[PDB]
């Protein structure tokens, strides 16, 4: 009927935040929430493959990508399934998340339930970079905080 | 009100040596913490923010670490330029509060040393001028009576 999820971001540093996911019928996934303790500017925001938190955010593994594509922005056709682009922090160090996406899901083969959200140090270049790395990680840099995606009431 | 506490209150150290100041908050400040350096007779400068991020144009010998309530600034290889007072500030809760500071002293180049003297001397003279201006002030009031 209506699928709901939630994610609590946690890291060694100052980043904190709660992310909410709602999906009505087989409509898009509405991502929402707030992230604090960021530097002003843009920060890569991706669903990584595993909800394995045993070794911090490193154990989350690479971007969630079942179709073996290359990294891109959210509007690209050539993109990972997890690639949701960038969240934007103000001078108050806060980002309001607001994202709608169709490739991710809260059920079926493209379910993110049981996987990890990660917010990054730098801006995601959306795969438009002049190097190998861009089409893997988008040069978003290190992982400030992450959390496993759980089912919400 | 968060009490941020630094130690040592001062310290002395030889060139090349490795130094570690600490800063301890009376509660968890989740790495909302900045390190400022203030050289003699100079304006403060930002070294580190969010506990561990270097500011722009900061030598990499400077590093910051810690979490929860306990943080530290570490100069890896101490040059002579680094004699200064260092301050930690937390911005997790209002009001923003500051350590009492750790003072740190030692145990082309000739002309930079020469130019440093003029501001120092002019500052010391200006102290004297305002000192004597405050001594005139009462006497001049008495003259208009």
């Amino acid at each position: 009927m209506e699928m709901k999820a939630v994610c609590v971001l946690k890291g060694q540093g100052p980043v904190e935040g709660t992310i909410h996911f709602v999906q009505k019928g087989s409509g898009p996934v509405v991502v929402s929430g707030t992230i604090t303790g960021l530097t002003k500017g843009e920060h890569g925001f991706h669903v990584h493959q595993f909800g394995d938190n045993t070794q911090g955010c490193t154990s989350a593994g690479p971007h969630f990508n079942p179709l073996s594509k290359k990294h891109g922005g959210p509007k690209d056709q050539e993109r990972h399934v997890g690639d949701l682009g960038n969240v934007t922090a103000g001078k108050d160090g806060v980002a309001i998340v607001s994202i709608e996406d169709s490739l991710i899901a809260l059920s079926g083969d493209y379910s993110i339930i049981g996987r990890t959200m990660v917010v990054h140090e730098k801006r995601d270049d959306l795969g438009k970079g002049d190097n190998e790395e861009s089409t893997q990680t988008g040069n978003a840099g290190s992982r400030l905080a992450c959390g496993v995606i759980g089912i919400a009431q | 009100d968060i009490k941020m506490t630094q130690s040592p209150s001062s310290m002395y150290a030889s060139l090349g040596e490795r130094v570690t100041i600490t800063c301890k908050a009376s509660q968890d400040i989740k790495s909302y913490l900045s390190w400022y350096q203030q050289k003699p007779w100079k304006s403060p400068k930002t070294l580190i923010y969010y506990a561990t991020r270097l500011a722009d144009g900061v030598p990499s010998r400077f590093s910051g670490s810690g979490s929860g309530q306990d943080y530290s600034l570490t100069i890896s290889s101490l040059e002579s330029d680094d004699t200064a007072t260092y301050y930690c500030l937390q911005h997790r809760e209002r009001p923003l509060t500051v350590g009492a500071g750790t003072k740190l002293e030692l145990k082309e180049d000739i002309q930079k040393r020469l130019l440093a003297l003029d501001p120092m001397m002019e500052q010391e003279i200006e102290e004297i001028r305002q000192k004597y201006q405050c001594k005139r002030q009462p006497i001049l009031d008495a003259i208009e009576a």
Partner: nanobody
Amino acid sequence: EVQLQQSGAELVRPGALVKLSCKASGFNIKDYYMYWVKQRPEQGLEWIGWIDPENDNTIYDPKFQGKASISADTSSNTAYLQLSSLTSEDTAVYYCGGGPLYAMDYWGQGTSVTVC
């Protein structure tokens, strides 16, 4: 290569009002917060307050709320600090700075105020 130009030295009678200024060049103060910081002689830094020039909202330390008054003119790209009912307690160097909420990117050279 940014600069904060602060007003010049002041020397005033007890009970005087004084208004310090901070003129920024190299950045739009609308994109930042403008902070003010006091340093009494032979002592450490006390943070007075900040203003968000984009909406003129000001936070203060309660210690100063009433004695000190912070304002910004976004047009002339200048920030202001106004100290009233001055005493010897107020003899200090006042630094203005600009930055996000989590860092001070830029510091002024400081304005000395002396009270007789």
